[PDB]
Ligand binder design. Sequence first.
Ligand SMILES: c1ccc(CCSc2cnn[nH]2)cc1
Length: 162
Amino acid sequence: MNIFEMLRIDEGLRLKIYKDTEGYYTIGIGHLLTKSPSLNAAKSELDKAIGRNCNGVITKDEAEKLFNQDVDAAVRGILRNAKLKPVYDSLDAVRRCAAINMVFQMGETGVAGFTNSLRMLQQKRWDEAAVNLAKSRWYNQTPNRAKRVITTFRTGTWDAYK
Ligand SMILES: c1ccc(CCSc2cnn[nH]2)cc1
């Protein structure tokens, strides 16, 4: 298991524009296109991302390329973030995957709400961090995925994905 396999499980693969759990236009392996309600706006974003006129449909190769770019962007965002980088660097490799998973799903705009969770993770207080992480809109709205990510932080194993 690695971050790509983990997120492929959590996000699935769809080759035509779909809506994510929040109702936003998405494609591929969880690639957000736009928060606008306009399907045309989503189609423009798709064509820009792929570099051709797609008509809302991509190939598996294209979905996997977008996915690699999106995982890399999440990692680089962590490494550029003064609050996230020290916590990330304190983690083992399996727990780093859980961190990337969260940033892939939620970005960085809500990092400050996770200040206490981040402190508990850096302190390696795994059970306490798991309890704190579940006190979130994230957990309530996507509980099965959040439970898998939280179990990964709690145990440092891939047990939730096996
Ligand atoms: C290290 C780095 C990141 C994380 C999850 C990020 S805390 C957050 C970021 N964006 N939304 N919530 C955990 C340990």
